């Protein structure tokens, strides 16, 4: 959330045309989606994350 934001900030503030803002926003998105667990290859970690998200509330009970 900080490197993507800094990169996005630099590529939007420099822009002379609107496509330079748009083509930077899409890269900000496309690095969030890959550094997070919502890609088709990081999907298995999201499946495994359900076990963590289960056992935390299991421990409360």
């Amino acid at each position: 959330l900080e490197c993507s934001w800094d990169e996005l900030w630099n590529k939007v503030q420099q822009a002379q045309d609107l496509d330079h803002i748009i083509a930077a926003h899409e890269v900000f998105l496309d690095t969030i989606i890959s550094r997070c667990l919502l890609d088709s290859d990081s999907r298995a970690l999201l499946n495994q994350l359900r076990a963590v998200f289960d056992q935390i509330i299991e421990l409360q009970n």
């Binding site: 609107l18 748009i22 926003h25 998105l29 997070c36 919502l38």
Partner: protein, 61 residues
Amino acid sequence: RATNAQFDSPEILRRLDVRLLEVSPGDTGWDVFSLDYHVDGPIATVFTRECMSHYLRVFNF
């Protein structure tokens, strides 16, 4: 109003609105909760609909 976010200009306070998802019976409310944050006008061309949907999935997780 209770927290210190009442200093904000009305535009950014206006753009947000809560968005329901559809419910299946006996589903917890944490799964059905996502903010919308629509943007309309010429700025909608700069930040498109597809961007917002991927951000909503990020919001869910």
